[PDB]
Amino acid sequence: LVHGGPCDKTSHPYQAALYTSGHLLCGGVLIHPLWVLTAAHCKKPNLQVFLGKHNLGQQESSQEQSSVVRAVIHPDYDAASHDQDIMLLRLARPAKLSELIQPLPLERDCSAQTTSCHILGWGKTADGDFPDTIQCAYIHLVSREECEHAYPGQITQNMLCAGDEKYGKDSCQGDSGGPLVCGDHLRGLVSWGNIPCGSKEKPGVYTNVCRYTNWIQKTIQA
Ligand SMILES: N=C(N)c1ccc(NCc2ncc(-c3ccccc3)[nH]2)cc1OCc1cccnc1
Numbered sequence: 572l573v574h575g576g577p578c579d580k581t582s583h584p585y586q587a588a589l590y591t592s593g594h595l596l597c598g599g600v601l602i603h604p605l606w607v608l609t610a611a612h613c614k615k616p617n618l619q620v621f622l623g624k625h626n627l628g629q630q631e632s633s634q635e636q637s638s639v640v641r642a643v644i645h646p647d648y649d650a651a652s653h654d655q656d657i658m659l660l661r662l663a664r665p666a667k668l669s670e671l672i673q674p675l676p677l678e679r680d681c682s683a684q685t686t687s688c689h690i691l692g693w694g695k696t697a698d699g700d701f702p703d704t705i706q707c708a709y710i711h712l713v714s715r716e717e718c719e720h721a722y723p724g725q726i727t728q729n730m731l732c733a734g735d736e737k738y739g740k741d742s743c744q745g746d747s748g749g750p751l752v753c754g755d756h757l758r759g760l761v762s763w764g765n766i767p768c769g770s771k772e773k774p775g776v777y778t779n780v781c782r783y784t785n786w787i788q789k790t791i792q793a
Contacts, residue, residue, distance in 0.1 A: 572690060572746055573697045573768045574738040575708030580625055583691055583705060585675035585757075588624050589660075589748065591615035595627065595701065598692045598749025600757055601674045604665040606791055609748030610760055610778065611648040611658040618642065620662060623671045627693055628703035633671040637664040643790050645783070655729050656762040656778045658748075659790050678756040681781040686754025688712060688733060690775070692761065694746030695768065701745060708740035712753070713774040721773045731759045731777045734770025741775050743768035751777045 587599030587607045597613035599620065607620055623633035641661035648655045666672050691707045710733045713721075718732035726732070733751055734741060742749065742761040751759030759777030764770065 572692045572694050572706035572708055572741070573743050574735075574740045575706040577704045578625070578691055578707035581670065582707070583625075584623070584671050584673035585750065586624070586691060586705065588621040588627065588693060589613055590619040590621065591617065595693060595745060597745070597747040598694070598761060599660065600750040600760070601666055601672065602677065602757070602787070603674055603791060604668065605662050607660040607662065608757070608760065608787070609658050609660060610656045610762055611644045612650065612653070612656060613748045614642055614644060614658060618660060620660065622666055623669065624705075626704050633669060635664075635667055635672060637662040639663065645786065652725070652727075653730075653763050653776070654727050657760060657783055659787065675750060675752065675757045676755070677784065677787065678753065678758045678781050679784050681779070683753070683758070683781070685712070688751060688753040688758065690733070690742050690746070690749065690751055690761065692742060692746030692749040694749075695743040708735065710735050710740055710770070710775070718774055718776070722776070726776070729779050729782050730762065731779045732774040733759070733777060734774035736771060739769035739771040741765070741768045741770035
């Protein structure tokens with residue numbers, strides 16, 4: 572995450588860190604004690620999920636680790652266009668809820684009224700390094716018309732755009748699958764955006780979570 576700052580220690584109990592062969596790979600969102608939501612492009616071998624983390628470089632008494640027993644990529648995910656970039660991960664070991672491990676409720680209304688939005692992750696910072704402490708930034712939803720002009724023919728109804736006109740606060744490599752939180756509900760998942768990261772003109776592009784209510788419910792209930 573570029574141009575942000577360290578998150579408050581208690582503000583992100585729904586944040587997951589995803590690892591593959593020891594590499595920090597992606598972020599994720601705890602939505603149910605058995606399920607973590609992330610981007611379909613985070614599909615990698617033997618995924619390991621860490622909940623209750625704040626600083627990746629130190630062992631924390633609140634952390635909980637789990638392997639993934641099932642990975643469910645949306646049937647219509649298109650890797651070339653990033654369309655429908657969503658995947659459900661079933662945990663081997665259900666989350667032991669605490670003050671620092673809690674699920675985040677989903678935004679179900681695609682016409683939801685404007686609320687305060689934020690993004691978070693352990694992705695690449697402004698200097699180009701990967702931070703130990705999770706970064707946070709306030710950002711705002713960008714109109715569909717402005718986003719379409721920023722990325723002609725690339726923005727679908729399954730994508731939302733968000734950014735910051737002042738500093739260009741943006742998600743980046745490694746933040747993938749992390750949450751775009753608006754009014755204490757999950758509004759989007761980190762999917763793609765500009766290179767280099769920075770949202771002053773070309774906003775970050777997020778999976779539009781409100782479009783996946785039925786698919787998420789049907790996956791968790793089957
Ligand atoms: N600027 C952003 N808001 C932004 C946020 C997250 C990501 N994640 C990386 C990522 N998304 C999708 C793929 C992918 C999909 C299919 C196949 C292989 C790869 N990889 C990228 C972002 O912007 C582009 C970007 C790329 C690389 C380095 N820096 C910025």
